[PDB]
Amino acid sequence: GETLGEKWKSRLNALGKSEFQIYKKSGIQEVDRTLAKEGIKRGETDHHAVSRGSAKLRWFVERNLVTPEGKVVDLGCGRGGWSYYCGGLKNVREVKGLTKGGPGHEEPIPMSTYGWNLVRLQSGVDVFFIPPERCDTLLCDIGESSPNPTVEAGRTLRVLNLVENWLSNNTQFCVKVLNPYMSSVIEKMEALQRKHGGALVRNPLSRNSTHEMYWVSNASGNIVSSVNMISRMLINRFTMRHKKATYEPDVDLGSGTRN
Numbered sequence: 659g660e661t662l663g664e665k666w667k668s669r670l671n672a673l674g675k676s677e678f679q680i681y682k683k684s685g686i687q688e689v690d691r692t693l694a695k696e697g698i699k700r701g702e703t704d705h706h707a708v709s710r711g712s713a714k715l716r717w718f719v720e721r722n723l724v725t726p727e728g729k730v731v732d733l734g735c736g737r738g739g740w741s742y743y744c745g746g747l748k749n750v751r752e753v754k755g756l757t758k759g760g761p762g763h764e765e766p767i768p769m770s771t772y773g774w775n776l777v778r779l780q781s782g783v784d785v786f787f788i789p790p791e792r793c794d795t796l797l798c799d800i801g802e803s804s805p806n807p808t809v810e811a812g813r814t815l816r817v818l819n820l821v822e823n824w825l826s827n828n829t830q831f832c833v834k835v836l837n838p839y840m841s842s843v844i845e846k847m848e849a850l851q852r853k854h855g856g857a858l859v860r861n862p863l864s865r866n867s868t869h870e871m872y873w874v875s876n877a878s879g880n881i882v883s884s885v886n887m888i889s890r891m892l893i894n895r896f897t898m899r900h901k902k903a904t905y906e907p908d909v910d911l912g913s914g915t916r917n
């Protein structure tokens with residue numbers, strides 16, 4: 659109780675260690691990352707995605723759920739997986755990625771993937787403190803999980819209020835909604851959808867251990883229904899036995915500069 663998502667979260671928290679690890683990957687999609695990771699380790703800067711995040715964003719983009727263009731701001735860029743992916747997209751002109759980095763968090767990694775010269779990544783930034791800037795696309799992949807969904811709600815609401823500050827009339831967007839099932843977050847998402855449209859969409863590359871959904875600009879659908887469908891899916895997935903992930907090839911981000 660009281661929402662279905664809360665029931666799922668409690669059941670998730672009650673799992674044994676081995677049971678949790680099995681559950682986390684049951685019937686999900688995964689990216690085949692081995693060779694890309696090995697190449698990056700060796701100092702290779704062409705082709706490779708810096709994280710499995712490039713493929714995660716590619717899933718939204720290839721389905722036109724978000725269509726990055728013009729000036730792209732990537733809030734919480736980490737190593738730069740979303741930023742470098744956008745750097746190669748036809749209608750993108752500029753990508754600014756901003757992230758905490760420092761001890762305990764991923765630092766931006768310099769790469770030479772296609773359109774890298776369009777991408778500027780900055781570490782040591784708290785995005786909640788910086789003045790919003792005009793942008794054509796607003797991306798945000800921030801949200802720290804908690805065993806306590808009330809804590810996640812407080813965090814999620816801060817992200818939602820943040821991104822609201824960066825959106826204009828016709829902004830393309832893709833925003834992680836860490837916990838979309840808590841009543842307070844439902845209420846906020848309904849208001850935001852009234853104002854900016856879009857809808858919440860579940861990415862098949864998300865793990866079963868999170869109820870994250872992404873608010874994407876080029877989608878429609880009732881907030882409550884979209885969230886409850888995912889609550890039911892995640893509950894259904896507890897019942898799977900002897901199941902694991904299905905892999906897909908990673909993204910090839912090419913090489914070279916763009917003018």
Ligand SMILES: CO[C@@H]1[C@H](O)[C@@H](COP(=O)(O)OP(=O)(O)OP(=O)(O)OC[C@H]2O[C@@H]([n+]3cn(C)c4c(=O)[nH]c(N)nc43)[C@H](O)[C@@H]2O)O[C@H]1n1cnc2c(=O)[nH]c(N)nc21
Pocket residue numbers: 670671672673674675678802803804805806865867868
């Ligand atoms: C010290 O408390 C830990 C952290 O709050 C969190 C792990 O931190 P991390 O920064 O890796 O979190 P994420 O990157 O978002 O991904 P996870 O997929 O590991 O965590 C997402 C949620 O998944 C749950 N969880 C996460 N882990 C690692 C477990 C687990 O081992 N057993 C278990 N029953 N549940 C979990 C918990 O509700 C988490 O909020 O997971 C917690 N954790 C660790 N061991 C346990 C545990 O034995 N039970 C439990 N309910 N939570 C646990």
Ligand SMILES: Nc1ncnc2c1ncn2[C@@H]1O[C@H](CSCC[C@H](N)C(=O)O)[C@@H](O)[C@H]1O
Pocket residue numbers: 708709710711712733734735736737738739740741756757758759763764783784785786799800801
């Ligand atoms: N307040 C904040 N300011 C800047 N970055 C933040 C932040 N809160 C969390 N973050 C960062 O946001 C990052 C998410 S990185 C997520 C993956 C990224 N989209 C990729 O494709 O590689 C984490 O590194 C985290 O530390």
